Write a new protein. Structure first.
Length: 269
């Protein structure tokens, strides 16, 4: 007796799954084949235990028509095949209009557009041009945005976004993005004179290319410390200032076009 009530439970772009009801009998096991019906490719044929009533044939060709026979075995003897035909799905499509929404040193968030097909989530391969080890991440199907955490500051990343549907991964959408630079820290006022201030700070995590220091009188535009400190300096003497004047200092980082947030403070000459 052949199995009955054959039904396909899940069809992916690479697999097909089905249940059924075993014919009340002895159980030597089952045989199951899947042959391209309208083409020439494999010929997946897999055996199954005697107590089976479901199956999962994976690793099939995308967008392909398959004949599926489900044979019940009993000692060299075979029974009539429960049949059906399934056509695999076309692989999943990569996300569209992938743009960066913002970044905060160690994290970058992005938003993309979804095609209209059965999805089971996303995956993000974030690769830094600097570092030598990337961070892989997975996402949930119901969201169209995601902040990537765990990056370095001021580092440039090649971010690959993918779509997921079971063991099916789409081709990627590539996105160039970089991190915010971490502002210098602990601005300390070492010395003063009616015409100058000596300031020291903690260098950023990034591997900046120098700083720009700004000072402004209380009713006059901020000026840059002309000489512009080399990235190797961590202290600078601000000269040519007015006496008894309360100045505001801004120490900012640079990695060739990226101004870090500004490190601030005030002190009077």
């Amino acid at each position: 007796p052949a199995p009955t009530d054959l039904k396909f439970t899940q069809v992916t772009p690479t697999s097909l799954s089905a249940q059924w009801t075993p014919p009340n009998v002895q159980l030597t096991g089952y045989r199951v084949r899947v042959t391209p019906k309208e083409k020439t490719g494999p010929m997946k044929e897999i055996n199954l235990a005697p107590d089976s009533s479901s199956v999962v044939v994976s690793g099939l060709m995308v967008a392909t028509k398959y004949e599926v026979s489900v044979y019940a075995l009993k000692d060299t003897l075979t029974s009539r095949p429960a049949q059906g035909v399934v056509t695999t799905l076309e692989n999943v499509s990569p996300p569209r209009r992938a743009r960066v929404t913002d970044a905060t040193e160690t994290t970058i968030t992005i938003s993309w557009r979804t095609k209209t097909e059965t999805i089971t989530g996303f995956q993000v391969d974030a690769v830094p041009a600097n570092g030598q080890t990337p961070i892989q991440r997975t996402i949930k199907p119901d969201v169209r945005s995601y902040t990537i955490t765990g990056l370095q500051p001021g580092t440039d990343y090649k971010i690959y976004l993918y779509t997921l549907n079971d063991n099916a991964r789409s081709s990627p959408v590539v996105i160039d993005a970089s991190t915010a630079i971490d502002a210098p820290s602990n601005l300390r006022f070492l010395a003063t004179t009616p015409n100058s201030l000596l300031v020291s700070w903690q260098p950023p995590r990034a591997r900046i290319t120098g700083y720009i220091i700004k000072y402004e009188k209380p009713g006059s535009p901020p000026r840059e410390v002309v000489p512009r400190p080399r990235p190797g300096v961590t202290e600078a003497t601000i000269t040519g200032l007015e006496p008894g004047t309360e100045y505001t200092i801004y120490v900012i980082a640079l990695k060739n076009n990226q101004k870090s947030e500004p490190l601030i403070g005030r002190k009077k000459t």
